């Protein structure tokens, strides 16, 4: 016997000192190196094996990072910041990771050179503030009324994905969807593309046939074949309550003693259904769409009035239809009003694609919701196309909200680095060295672009750095396709200011978070 006595429980480890900092920085560098080669217009794609047996062939950094599992907590923090960048702005996920990895890599030097992490953190925060100032300075305005400028911005956003082959069609689709989704009510502007901009993937066909509809498409068919599958100018009526006969909430029981009470009860059930159908018909609609089941007898009474019925649509699909055709979902048909009747859909067609029926409510006038019908080679191709379309729509929304633009291809990075170095020339304290280190660490984006392009990093980067020292060279970047220095006033690669601001903020703050950390303790039970 005599079991050992000790302060902390077993399986409780603890390491401290330079080892923890080095391990955290190495984990961040490994996370960066995982997706270092997936940046730029010449990025290669990666194939990821889902544990559930799926395959994710993707170029996006966030999907790659979220599809892998790590044990080191610093890698978990890096994945979390990647997800945060993806959610906040939409793109820039594989740039912020690289930036954070480089910043931690250059901070490791000062950590090893007897400098306390707090000084490094203060220098990092001053550098971040000056980066924000420089980006706000070098930005240019954009008028959202010019469709060509918006298309160019979306193209520059999607030149690095696999959809650059059909870039023109993709940009048109994304811009149209964002414009359709844009809404304002009660003075509250709203661009909510995660609910009212739906992407539907139907494998087969050709990618060139993909388009955005002026309406909503659902995978539903008429309840009864006698119903019309083609109505010219339908009057939409939406419901979210069953058209059947159902038990009440209170516990209720009948007690039948007379002979004719059973038939009377059944007849009153039928009459209740008939009354509901008559209440619906009194508005004289053309179709009825419900989120809950519709009884066969109700279907008969609806067909008697020449009304097409769709049985069970989802909540989100019903909301999209309401936004598109101008209807208003109601629960009790007794309280139906003419305002709730959905007029504005220019055509309702129920056609067959492949071996399945699909319902189209397209041709709407002024629709506030849309569906993007994607057709392609297979499921994974369509998934990647959908991810690229999400990136494009997020970029379009960011530009619509924040109409300033900054040069791409590392031109902004080099301009900010040069401005930071010029400002650091004036400081005299010990904080200047980490400040300049961050300034030059910001140059990783053009270096990675040159490395991915296959060109030589050293001389190209040196020439670019020399070029940025002149009076007006803030728009000089690199070609990701030819490996040459070009003015981005000519190449036309521009990025939203919000995306760059979010990227720099997230990278610097992740570096700050991982610099503060020491004395890792693990193994304790909840």
């Amino acid at each position: 016997g005599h079991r050992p006595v000790l302060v902390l429980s077993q399986n409780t480890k603890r390491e401290s000192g330079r080892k923890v900092q080095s391990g955290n920085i190495n984990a961040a560098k490994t996370i960066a190196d995982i997706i270092r080669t997936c940046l730029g217009p010449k990025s290669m794609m990666k194939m990821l094996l889902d544990p559930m047996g799926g395959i994710v062939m993707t170029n996006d950094g966030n999907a790659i990072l979220r599809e892998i599992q790590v044990q080191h907590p610093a890698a978990k923090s890096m994945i979390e910041i990647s997800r945060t960048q993806d959610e906040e702005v939409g793109d820039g996920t594989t740039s912020v990771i690289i930036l954070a990895g480089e910043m931690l890599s250059v901070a490791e030097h000062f950590l090893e050179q007897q400098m306390h992490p707090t000084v490094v953190i203060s220098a990092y925060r001053k550098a971040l503030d000056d980066m924000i100032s420089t980006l706000k300075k070098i930005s240019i305005p954009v008028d959202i009324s010019d469709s060509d400028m918006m298309l160019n911005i979306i193209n520059s956003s999607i030149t690095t994905k696999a959809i650059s082959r059909w870039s023109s069609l993709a940009c048109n689709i994304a811009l149209d969807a964002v414009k359709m989704v844009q809404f304002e009510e009660n003075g509250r502007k709203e661009i909510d593309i995660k609910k009212y901009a739906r992407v539907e993937k139907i494998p087969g066909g050709i990618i060139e046939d993909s388009c955005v509809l002026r309406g909503v498409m659902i995978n539903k068919d008429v309840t009864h074949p006698r119903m019309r599958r083609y109505i010219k100018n339908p009057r939409i009526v939406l419901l979210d309550s069953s058209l059947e006969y159902k038990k009440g909430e209170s516990q209720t029981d009948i007690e039948i003693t007379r002979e004719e009470d059973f038939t009377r009860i059944l007849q009153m059930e039928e009459e209740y259904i008939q009354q509901l159908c008559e209440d619906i018909i009194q508005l004289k609609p053309d179709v009825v769409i419900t989120e809950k089941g519709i009884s066969d007898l109700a279907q008969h009474y609806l067909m008697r009035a020449n009304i097409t019925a769709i049985r069970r649509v989802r909540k989100t699909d019903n909301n999209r239809i309401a936004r598109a055709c101008g209807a208003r979902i109601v629960s009790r048909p007794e309280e139906l009003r003419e305002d709730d009747v959905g007029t504005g859909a220019g055509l309702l067609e129920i056609k067959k694609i492949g071996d399945e029926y699909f319902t189209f409510i397209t041709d709407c006038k002024d629709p506030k919701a849309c569906t993007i019908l994607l057709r392609g080679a297979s499921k994974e191709i369509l998934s990647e196309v959908e991810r690229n379309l999400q990136d494009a729509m997020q970029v379009c929304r960011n530009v619509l909200l924040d109409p300033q633009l900054v040069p791409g291809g590392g031109a902004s990075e080099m301009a900010v680095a040069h401005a930071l170095t010029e400002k650091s020339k004036a400081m005299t304290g010990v904080e200047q060295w980490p400040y300049r280190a961050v300034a030059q660490a910001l140059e990783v984006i053009p270096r990675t672009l040159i490395q991915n392009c296959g060109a030589s990093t050293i001389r190209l980067l040196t020439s670019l750095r020399a070029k940025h020292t002149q009076e007006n060279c803030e728009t000089w970047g690199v070609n990701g396709e030819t490996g040459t220095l070009v003015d981005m006033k000519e190449l036309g690669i521009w990025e939203p200011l919000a995306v760059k601001l979010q990227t720099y903020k997230t990278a610097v703050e992740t570096a700050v978070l991982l610099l503060r950390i020491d004395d890792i303790v693990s193994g304790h039970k909840k």
Binding site: K46, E269, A377, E384
Partner: protein
Amino acid sequence: AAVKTLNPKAEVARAQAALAVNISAARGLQDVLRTNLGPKGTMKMLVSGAGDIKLTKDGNVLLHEMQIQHPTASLIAKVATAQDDITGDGTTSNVLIIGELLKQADLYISEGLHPRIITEGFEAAKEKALQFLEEVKVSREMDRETLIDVARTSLRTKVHAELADVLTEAVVDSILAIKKQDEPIDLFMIEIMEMKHKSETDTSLIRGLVLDHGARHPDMKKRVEDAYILTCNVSLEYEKTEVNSGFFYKSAEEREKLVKAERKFIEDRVKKIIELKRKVCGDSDKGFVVINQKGIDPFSLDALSKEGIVALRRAKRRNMERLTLACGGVALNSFDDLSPDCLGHAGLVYEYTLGEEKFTFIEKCNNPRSVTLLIKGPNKHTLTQIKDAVRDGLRAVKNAIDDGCVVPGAGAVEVAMAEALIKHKPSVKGRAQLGVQAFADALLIIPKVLAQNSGFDLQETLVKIQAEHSESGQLVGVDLNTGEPMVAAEVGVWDNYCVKKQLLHSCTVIATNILLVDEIMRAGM
């Protein structure tokens, strides 16, 4: 590796390893599926884990039923699944073209070339090839002869010669029967019914419906000559109240009265049906058939059979529309207001019993817009193979009718496409000409595989065909009986234009995406 450093139990293939793995998987799939192409191909035999026997020749069925656990194989299987879902043909050609594109691309990548240039060449070659395919298609009025030729060119590749000859007439007649002018063809209106009592050549087309269920009452007539069809969706069995009624009585007489009075609701609808039947046909010459999507309890069955009415219960949901289009009635969800004008008509209804199963035939319809295909064979695997073949034939005929054009087959179209691509290659700038050449060589796989399956050699047959095409300019294919060049237009070897376009698009897209994959991870655990 970085991933292995972060996750020790993770598998990683990077740089040339990913390309090698993907190309090896594609080559293995291609090698398996080479023998499928062409009518001279070899039947594959598939045994499942439960011992079920599957005789087939389709690329998609083979892909689904091979015991393969490879990622690239999964991607190619999904591509072929989409190909089958939309067009219904070209899966074997899909796999062959994907594998040959990957092999030809590797032939240049292994010499230090970068895959991006190959992909650019592939894109340019695909654009030119689509232009040429649009140029070469034959716009024709789809009469019966052309549809028969297309159905033959599918079914002979799928099944035996005589069986294919029978299925050609069956499929073409069925499609022409259900087809409406300037209206999309609905393939749900063709029942594919299986029976297992005759030879495979006994498969035929019935201008009506065959139902896998018969009358459940022995006293009902087994054969009705002139019938009136009542297609209904009304429950004719006892239904309990939704609100938990229960009965309360104080003596046996009250119990008897309540028992008699609890059948009145269903009895009213049965009486309505009987009154309609009596009014419509006052003699015994005409018949009355009731097909119900819901159950019919024995009491209602006896009541109906006492009036000379044949009642079928628990019919299929689509059978409502099938009977409405074929017989010509109105599917009723309630008997509130039923009139003789909602009754369908059938010129013959009879019951056929096969072992423990019973079938009902509804023939001699006036103008059946929906028909059925009766698959007959001695074995289950024979029935499955015939069903797959007729699916392929129906898809081919529907595609031929939809797209008013049709493309010469027998390997001519891709030979001409490759020659045109070679001619156009100098117009491509840079080193994408290598990708264009690889695309042309990959397109040339189909005549090669056809030559092997016919028992000939690639080099001699291919050079003969290409020389004939260059000298004459006609669309010359592969004669699988002699190996000489042959113009597929006269002999009636046709291919679907949509199938070729889908093949080009999907193969190019998937090959480009696979070639650009440089790193494979399995680190989700």
